Every structure is written in C-alpha cells, then in structure tokens.
Amino acid sequence: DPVEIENRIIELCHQFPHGITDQVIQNEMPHIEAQQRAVAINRLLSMGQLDLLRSNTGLLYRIKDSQNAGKMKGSDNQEKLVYQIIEDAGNKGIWSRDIRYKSNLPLTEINKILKNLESKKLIKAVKSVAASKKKVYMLYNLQPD
DNA sequence: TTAGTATATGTGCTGCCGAAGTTAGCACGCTTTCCACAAGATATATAAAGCCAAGAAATCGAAATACTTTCAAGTTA
C-alpha cells in the first residue's frame, strides 16, 4: 500500500530529524522493492513534505520544517514559505524589501508574518550596520555575523 | 654562405552603413524608521434646540357580514 509506505517513511523521518537514507529505509522495510520505495519517495517529494539533501554519504530525505511554528494564525503555508528563505539567509540576514520581493506577498501580510514570528520567538530583527536603512531578520538560534 | 620560406610591416584597398546635413517666395497664426513635538483623550455646567432611533396610541384601508333593491317566476283574482 503506497499510503502505508508513505506513512512509514514519515514515521522514520520523525524518528530521525537529521534525515534517513535509502539503506536505512530498506533495513526498516526490507520486504518492499526499491521501485516501490522510489515511487513513494517521488510522491512524497511531489506533495511537498520531504526535502532532499546531498551529503558525502549519499542522499538524505528530511521531513520539512513544520513542527517549529511561530505563525499559527491563518495558515502554516505562508509561515513555512517565508521561514524557508529566512533560514536560507540566516547569518547574513535579509532586508524586509528583499523578503517582500522574494515572497511576492503584500507588505501588510509579510509584516503580520514577521510580527507573529517575533512574538513566538523564531526570528530576531537587527539593524544592519553596513546600511542603516531597514532591519534584517535572522534566526533566533544563529549567532549574528 | 646563399636560396627558399614565414612574418609582420605599413599600406592600400573595399564597402559600410550611416551623417550631417541639405531642399525656393508672403499673410495668417516609493520605502524604512526615526523621531520628537505637540496633539488624542481624557472629568465638567451649561443654558439652548435639532436630530435619530425604541415604544405607545391613532387612525386609515379594507375585508367579511348585515340591509335594502331588484328582478323574475309564481300566486289569489
């Protein structure tokens, strides 16, 4: 059952937040073929709950960041669809204008998202000393460059 | 040492399309923040009338019966 295969893969991803490899998936479920496992992984990547990483050991399939929530009001869709580039920037930070241009969302919407994230302690706003024009948003856990 | 060969040497050729310059005589006619200074938002008479929305009473509109008229067919003659 492909639904059961996807559920088991999601459970394995939950158990291993750092990601799982095809070897681990096969060791956990050896009675299923590599073709079925690949079809399940493709369906998961198409529906958008897993992300692929290329490490020196091979391929890793990690559950998308959804448990860490700072903006639950409305929908987690925009929350994660902003946190993606927020994390991508991370140490270097990113201005509000750049966040708006990358999200293609209204200024009011992005401001609400940022305010909710700051209220739930997921992002920190720091004044850019190089160009004191706007405040860049970074991850609360990362050290400011 | 000398004839054959490769190179650059400036030169001189070709097109290359474009460059300046031309075309004659009158009368009409937005964003971030950041910033600082002063302006909401506040009690309080206070007389005054006009306004804008619940209730209570009133009367208009008219509908379902009660009178009179009217036929029309039938009676005492």
Q: Domain of A51: which CATH number? A: 1.10.10.10
User: How many Å from the CA of A131 to C1' of B3?
Assistant: 76
Nearest nucleotide to A100 (CA to C1') is B31
Task: Give the residue numbers spanning the domain of A50.
Answer: 2-63
Alpha carbons A42 and A34: distance in angstroms, whole number: 12
Resolution (A): 3.0
A115 touches strand B (CB under 7 A): no
**Cβ atoms A10, A49 nearer than 8 A:** yes
| CA angle, A73 then A50 then A96, to 5° | 45
Experimental determination approach used: cryo-EM
Q: How many helices (H) and strands (E) does chain A have?
A: 6, 4
Report CA-CA distances (Å) from A112 to A1, A73, A119.
42, 10, 10
In this structure, what token pair is assigned to residue A31? 């009675």
**Cβ atoms A86, A100 nearer than 8 A:** no
A97 touches strand B (CB under 7 A): yes
A132 touches strand B (CB under 7 A): yes
Alpha carbons A143 and A140: distance in angstroms, whole number: 8
User: How many Å from the CA of A118 to C1' of B60?
Assistant: 68
Instruction: Give the residue among A113, A121, A52, A104 at the shortest CA–CA distance from A78.
Output: A113
Alpha carbons A39 and A6: distance in angstroms, whole number: 10
Instruction: Give the residue among A106, A90, A97, A68 at the shortest CA–CA distance from A138.
Output: A90
